[PDB]
Amino acid sequence: NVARIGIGQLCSSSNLKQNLEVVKSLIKKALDQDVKVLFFPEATDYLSRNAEHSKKLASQTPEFISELQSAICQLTKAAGKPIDISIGIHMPPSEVNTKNGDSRVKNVLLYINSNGEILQKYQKLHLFDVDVPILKESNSVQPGSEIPSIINTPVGKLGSCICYDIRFPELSLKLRSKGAQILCFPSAFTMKTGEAHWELLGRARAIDTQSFVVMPAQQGEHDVYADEAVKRISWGHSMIIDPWGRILSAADLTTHDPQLIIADLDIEAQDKIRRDMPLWAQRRRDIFGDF
Amino acid sequence: NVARIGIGQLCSSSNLKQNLEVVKSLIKKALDQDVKVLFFPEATDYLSRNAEHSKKLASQTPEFISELQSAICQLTKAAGKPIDISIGIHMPPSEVNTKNGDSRVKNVLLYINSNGEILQKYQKLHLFDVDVPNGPILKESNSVQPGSEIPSIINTPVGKLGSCICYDIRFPELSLKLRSKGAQILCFPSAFTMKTGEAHWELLGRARAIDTQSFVVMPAQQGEHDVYADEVKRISWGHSMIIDPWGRILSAADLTTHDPQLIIADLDIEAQDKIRRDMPLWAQRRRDIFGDF
Structure with missing residues (x-):
């Protein structure tokens, strides 16, 4: 009856089957803690060495997902209680795409x-393209074409984003306009940009929308040679933020083992903040339009 | 092990929660009989008075499905044995649909x-639309959205299943195509009128069975439906039965009660293998004349 959510922080390798074992173990642990909704990071299925490597691994993801769906059913039936999962993966192109x-x-x-x-x-909307030098995420990754609909989760109304989306505030604002009480930003940040902006961005989106903000992150040095030079290290620091900008819960920084980060969301205090500072009733829709 | 299947025959009302209690009771009876796969009819969740009644009742069905998924987990865990369930329901329009x-x-x-x-x-592909000047007028697709796919074969505990719904049975190309994709078993969950039921129900089941050399599961609504039970007369032919690849009726409903009943049969897969080897209808087709599906 308490709005308990969790983050499954991990450090995905390029071995999808290894990564799945970690996810199932974290879900099992979350069920024991009575977590109602468990959030996993971007690219939980795998991190890759390059776009060509990513393409080959993406073909293994459909089997990752199907085995994950059955693991979920088995674990909740064995535990006798439900849990919902939010998890970022790489989807291969469909046959229409081919x-x-x-x-x-x-x-x-x-x-x-x-x-x-x-x-x-939800398919990520914002991609990193720079054309001075030149690096184009969109050469290998298809941008999404929709703002996602709000999900009625066991702990409230969720608006779902992915990683780089967090830097574009109009997306978060629009999700609040559609009724979100909670936002998530499953992510993998570099150490540099992670240290600079990870916590600032989370708190900013939290107070901008007066929402709970879930920040599931990859953390550590990824083994992108585990399916058989290139190095990949994620900032981590998974955390859960309240509508006031307070950090409710953050990752233990003194271990790189997978870990569960838990918080109980005080929805009633959120109702009071939204009532006392009615930012959405105060917008200048005569100036900016209506979204 | 033993390829034991079951049909759950019932008479759905307009009261989803009442119908769910019947469904769970039949699942429990089927676990006790070691049924591996249990087939329910078309519109097991409800029968309605009209299209607007159906549109309102369908909004309750997602809760019906979630509570059924939970009863399955509970009943199988309590029984210590597994069972699969095939059940026809109505789904309300999606968010994007509206x-x-x-x-x-x-x-x-x-x-x-x-x-x-x-x-x-599987979303039913074939709908009954008719517009004859001076009756009969009926446009099922005014109130019901057709599906867009031939379903994939399911690998069940008892063999490869191709699933159809009711009016689908009248279109032999669908059944032939499902055989093409690997079906050992076809099912046609149905609610038939008394007139067409007596004329064609058994004939259609046996025809699709020998056309494709498949086991054919015929789960049916039986009786007069109480379509005011959530607060027009609807009577279903019933006669649920299970048919073998030779057209033999293996098992048929007791027609002397409208009470929910379980109909059971053990499928002789080895006998099917031999029939399909010894009359290889699918190697004998004239694809030079008809193409390939």
Whole structure:
């Protein structure tokens, strides 16, 4: 009856089967702690060495997901209680895509309920393209085409984003306009940008929208040679933030083992903050339009 | 081990929670009989008075499905043995469906495993539309959205299943195509009128069985439906039965009671293998004349 959520912080390798064992273990641990909704990071299925490597691994993800859906069903039936999963993966191009000549993976966030049913597939909207030098995420990753609909989770109304989305505030604002009480930003940040902006961005989106903000992150040095030079290290620091900007819960920084970060959301205090500072009633829609 | 299947025959009312209690009772009886896969009819969740009644009742069905998935987990865990469930229901329009003006319900056949996982939602492909000047007028697709896919074969505990729904049975190409994709078993969850039921129900089942050399499961609503039970007369032919690849009726409903009943048969897969080897209808087709499906 308490709005308890959790983050499964980990350090995904390029071995999808290894990564799945960690996810199942974290879900089992979360069920023991009576977590109602468990949030995993971006690219939980795998991190890759390069876009060509990513394309090959993406073909293994459909089997990752199906085994994950069945693990969820088995674990909740064994535990006798439900848990919902939010998890970021790489989706391979469909057969429509193949025929259209699109090879591009899709950065997708799955919302999966306790019966292993996928309720949402949010595809990341914002990609990092720079054209001075030049680096184009969109050469290998297909941008999404929709603002996701709000999900009615066991702990409240969720608006779901992925990683780089966090830097574009109009997306978060729009999700509040559609009724979100909670936002998530499953992510993998570099050490540099992680240290500079990870916590600032989370808190900013929290107070901008007066929402709980879930910040599930990859943490540590990724083994992108575990499916058989290139190095990949994620800032981590997974955390849960309240509508006032307070950090409710953050990762133990003194171990790089996978860990569960838990917080109970005080929805009533959120109602009071939203009532006392009614930012959405105060917008200048005669100036900016209506979204 | 023994390829034991079951049909759950019932008479759905307009009261979803009442119908769910019947469904769970039959699941429990089927676990006690060591049924591996239990087939329910079309519209097991409810029968309605009209299309607007159906549109309102369909909004309750998601809760019906979630509570069924939970009862399956509970009953199998309590029984210590697994069972799979094939059940026809109505699905309300999706969020995007309404965002395009489609308020129509969907005739969907769910396959749900021993862990509550939904492995397939098949949306009925064939609808009864008719517009004869001076009657009969009937446009099922005014109130019901057709599906867009031939379903994939399901690998069940008792063999490869191709799932269809009711009016689908009248279109032999669908059954032939399902055999093409690997089906050993076809199912046609149905609610038939008394007139067409007596004329064609058994004939249609046996025909599709020998056309494709498959086991054919015929789960049916039976009786007069209480379509005012959530607060027009609807009577279903019933006669649920299970048919073998030779057209033999293996097992048939007792017609002397409208009470929910379980109909059971053990499928002789080895005999099917021999029939399909010894009359290889699918090697004998004239694909030079008909193409390939």
